[PDB]
Design a protein around this ligand. Structure first.
Ligand code: AMP
Ligand code: MN
Lengths: 213, 214
């Protein structure tokens, strides 16, 4: 089948988290990874990664550092979220000078010309729908407008294969991709989600937008 | 100091929750509590509480029942969110007939009216800004329009005392208010949040609106 988007940008945020009985409502991004997937060659053409220095809870709990694999010295070495969106936009602008990529709000037909369509792919509506949305509203930051529509890969998986997977790891195993060990985080989790997305593309899945704000 | 609002309605929603890493599910309100605080006498003149039956994930996780203290028999005995918003509006309408309450930021006529102004008070912008907002848009429910502006008591606390509190429990402790038992949730967290507001009122804090959505 012919794909609608010529590129996919896969994002899997890591955030502050605790397991200690207390009542936490807000979470802060601590890692911003993204991989540019080529939906016709299956290769990763570019990558972005930044460590976000949390402001509201600057000290990572032991549970968080164990779960995400991020060490305190890395978020201490990182930039605040506002500077992180700036670097992410410069990266988005760089792959546009290189790949001639545009973000369109409602595509009905694939490109037949020199332009290349692109969309963001997440494993859930949590990254761009809850995490970055509430934090941008809470910190009153200017959120890039192209991050308001994305592809929920989990919903796409549930409908293309007609089965509920046991997480992102369970999804990879059910299609023959067997990986063992600790749960991957950050950029490594983004690469694995892109590996899943590319496998679904080869199986005949047409990636379409699932959420709009 | 003279207060702007004669009554405050304090809300502390409880919702389904999990703590298991990159496994994010949708969350649904499971308790809708509210206490009517009298900002001149410091007393609670009325209370509202309802247990909400979650539809997308009806079975409370062990982590959720541990954190909130809410048992499964209570949410199975409760009503869905749509019916709960209906009951909450009936309560708001009852306390307006009773207390002569309107929800308005200011009276423009000179004081020829015994009418009483009211505002909603929550700990952080999460209750009415994230919890009830995102769930109403996802379930395509009609959210009461008076729930679009509220007082963020934590922001009011950070500015009135010039210190960052470690949650509602940490905030109450710094002013001497010590409670025993498990971390309060739902109606008990609503009563204690109203106690904090009354402490701030007695210390001379004028409660103002902090967040608006309309
Ligand atoms: N540590 C936490 N992890 C995940 N969710 C939480 C945590 N603490 C509180 N919540 C959620 O926040 C809601 C409100 O709790 P409270 O802050 O006590 O009013 C709870 O019902 C949970 O859904
Ligand atoms: Mn709360």
């Amino acid at each position: 089948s012919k794909q609608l988007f010529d590129y996919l940008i896969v994002i899997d945020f890591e955030s502050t988290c605790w397991n200690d009985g207390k009542h936490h409502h807000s979470q802060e991004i601590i890692e911003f990874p993204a991989v540019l997937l080529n939906t016709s060659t299956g290769q990763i053409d570019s990558e972005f990664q930044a460590y976000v220095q949390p402001q509201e809870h600057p000290i990572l709990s032991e549970f968080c550092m164990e779960l995400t694999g991020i060490k305190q010295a890395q978020v201490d070495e990182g930039v605040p979220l506002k500077i992180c969106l700036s670097q992410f936009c410069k990266w988005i602008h760089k792959i546009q000078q290189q790949k001639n990529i545009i973000f369109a709000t409602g595509i009905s037909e694939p490109s037949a010309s020199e332009v290349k369509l692109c969309a963001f792919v997440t494993w859930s509506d949590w990254d761009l729908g809850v995490c970055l949305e509430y934090e941008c509203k809470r910190k009153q930051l200017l959120k890039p407008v192209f991050l308001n529509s994305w592809i929920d890969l989990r919903a796409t998986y549930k409908l293309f294969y007609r089965r509920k997977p046991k997480g992102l790891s369970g999804a990879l195993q059910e299609v023959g991709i067997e990986f063992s060990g600790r749960e991957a985080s950050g950029l490594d989790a983004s690469r694995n989600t892109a590996l899943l997305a590319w496998k679904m593309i080869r199986d005949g899945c047409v990636m379409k937008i699932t959420r709009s704000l």
